[PDB]
Design a protein around this ligand. Structure first.
Ligand SMILES: O=C(O)CCC(=O)C(=O)O
Ligand SMILES: [Mn+2]
Length: 202
DNA sequence: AGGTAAACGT
DNA sequence: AACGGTATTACCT
């Protein structure tokens, strides 16, 4: 019944914290605005993104990279809000990863139709640390597979406040998001946000 | 050697 | 529309 070895879903874990989380997303984006990044191959992603914390995930021509500087503003990413950090630590603890210290939070925003094709999170040098993923606003279908792209997928609806954590044996599993269905949510109005916490540095 | 980008047709 | 090809290569370090 558990998501996978080392992996768990904490349904509605972030429900009570969500209004403050969303105020702080708005604050982060007021400094480093959401933008749709362009892949190395030249395609614009459907998800709009920004980052907070000491390191931010970015693409550039040469690949994927963590950087301490937002290439759009040329200034450091905004500091990680304490609300984000406190929620992360509680969720990580509840999921069995009490020692997790993220230094990076990638904020994804899904408009209707936006998706994330199956991928692995492998840009982090220390793969001992888990990923903590917090869903806010409109629901989305999350794909969670195995070590190989063709391993069979579990498909789970992720609703507002749901937190998923993966690590250990499932750290490098393929995962993704199916094209967002249009809808209404009273706190985000017409979108989904996802916060993805990582330990990106050493 | 090995790391690793990947987001159209059936 | 769920599944899988593509990187079965071309380039870095
Ligand atoms: O949006 C999600 O639920 C997953 C996001 C994700 O996998 C990523 O940003 O790497
Ligand atoms: Mn991911």
């Amino acid at each position: 019944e558990p998501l996978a070895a080392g992996a768990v879903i904490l349904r509605r874990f972030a429900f009570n914290a969500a209004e403050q989380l969303i105020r702080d997303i708005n604050d982060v984006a007021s400094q480093s605005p959401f933008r749709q990044m362009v892949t190395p191959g030249g395609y614009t992603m459907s998800v709009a993104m920004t980052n907070c914390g000491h390191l931010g995930w970015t693409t550039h021509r040469q690949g994927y990279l963590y950087s301490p500087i937002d290439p759009q503003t040329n200034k450091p990413w905004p500091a990680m809000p304490q609300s984000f950090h406190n929620l992360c630590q509680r969720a990580a603890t509840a999921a069995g990863y009490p020692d997790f210290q993220p230094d990076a939070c990638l904020i994804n925003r899904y408009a209707p139709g936006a998706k994330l094709c199956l991928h692995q999170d492998k840009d982090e040098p220390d793969l001992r640390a888990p990923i903590v993923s917090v869903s806010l606003g409109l629901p989305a279908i999350f794909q969670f597979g195995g070590l190989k792209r063709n391993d069979p997928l579990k498909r789970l609806l992720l609703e507002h406040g749901d937190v998923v954590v993966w690590g250990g044996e499932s750290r490098l599993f393929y995962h993704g998001i199916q094209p967002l269905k249009a809808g209404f949510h009273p706190l985000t109005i017409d979108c989904r946000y996802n916060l993805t916490f990582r330990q990106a540095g050493k």
